[PDB]
Structure 1
């Protein structure tokens, strides 16, 4: 199987986990701006498009940290070996969105082939989940390309035990000499602390400042 049961008994977060899961269930959202000045340059020297690269980079970062790939399966806590991005797609024609996923791959060119393929096949499918059930080993990525925002937060009526992170991007902006992308991260406190989210963001930024291949 593609996940491994986690050793809660010996975890340094064991008390945190029970506290934030059942005693005081909560989570948080944070919005920060990622500098994509370097990445804009890289993309310019290539044929990649922005959105597919950001999915790639975000999935890559998530796949490096266990605490972003936890879930409850059969009442037990597991870590997925790896997770695939579930991203939103906007249909111009109906002005509605759909959520799709494709397999992640550490090889950026194979990821692009996966993405183009999924898009080829469901570009005109206006169902909300054209592919049917969402694979359990997922992360959620959404984009609001039409507007910049300083904050985004999802108010959810019930989030018991849903630990996959939700990342939302807005339209980027030029702030002085920099091109900044607002990114909102929303997690559950049972599995993730402020530290973990900050480590994800610092890692993402690093990725944005590095060669693609």
Structure 2
């Protein structure tokens, strides 16, 4: 299979996992600003577009840390070998959105081909899920390109055992010499502590500051 059953009995976080899963169930969200000044220049020197690149980079960073790819399957804790991005697409015509997913690839060029191909095929489909069921091994990404925000939070009436991270980006803005992008990350505390979120964000910032290929 594409997942491994995680060894909960010998995990250093086993007490935290039961505590935040069942004793005091909770998740948290944080919004931080990533510096995309360097990424903007890399983009300027290429034919890639902003949204797909951010999807790629967020998926790449998630795909590096196990704690962001956990799930309960058959009542057991597993880690997906890899997760694919599920992202939102806006339809100008109806002013509604759809969620699509495409296979992740560590090759940026192959990722771009997967993306354009899904986009090609469902750009006109207004169902909420044009592809049908969401793949179990997913991460959620969404964008609000029309407004800048300093904070974002989802208030969900039930999030029991749902461990996939939720990432939302706003419109970026010029903050003196820098171009900053607000990014909100929302996770379940059973699998992620503040350290793990900070580590994901720091790694995404480094990827934004590195060559695309």
Instruction: After superposition, give the CA deviation of every residue in 1:114-145 in whole Å (9 maximum; x if it has no partner).
Output: 00000000000000000000000000000000
SS in 2 for 1:186: strand
Instruction: After superposition, give the CA deviation of every residue in 1:131-176 in whole Å (9 maximum; x if it has no partner).
Output: 0000000000000000000000000000000000000000000000
Distance 1:126 1:178 in 2: 37
Q: Shift of residue 26 of structure 1? A: 0.1
Distance 2:14 2:182 in 1: 32
RMSD of aligned Cα (Å): 0.1
Instruction: After superposition, give the CA deviation of every residue in 1:176-210 in whole Å (9 maximum; x if it has no partner).
Output: 00000000000000000000000000000000000
Distance 1:116 1:150 in 2: 30
Distance 2:31 2:198 in 1: 11
Instruction: After superposition, give the CA deviation of every residue in 1:50-78 in whole Å (9 maximum; x if it has no partner).
Output: 00000000000000000000000000000
SS in 2 for 1:182: strand
Distance 1:114 1:77 in 2: 29
Distance 1:61 1:14 in 2: 24
Q: Runs of at least 4 residues of structure 1 off by over 6 A?
A: none
Q: Shift of residue 97 of structure 1? A: 0.2
Distance 1:165 1:103 in 2: 17
Q: Shift of residue 2 of structure 1? A: 0.1
SS in 1 for 2:179: strand
SS in 2 for 1:155: strand
Q: Shift of residue 21 of structure 1? A: 0.1
SS in 1 for 2:162: coil
SS in 2 for 1:71: strand
Distance 1:207 1:144 in 2: 22
Q: Shift of residue 25 of structure 1? A: 0.1
Distance 2:94 2:12 in 1: 49
Distance 2:15 2:112 in 1: 41
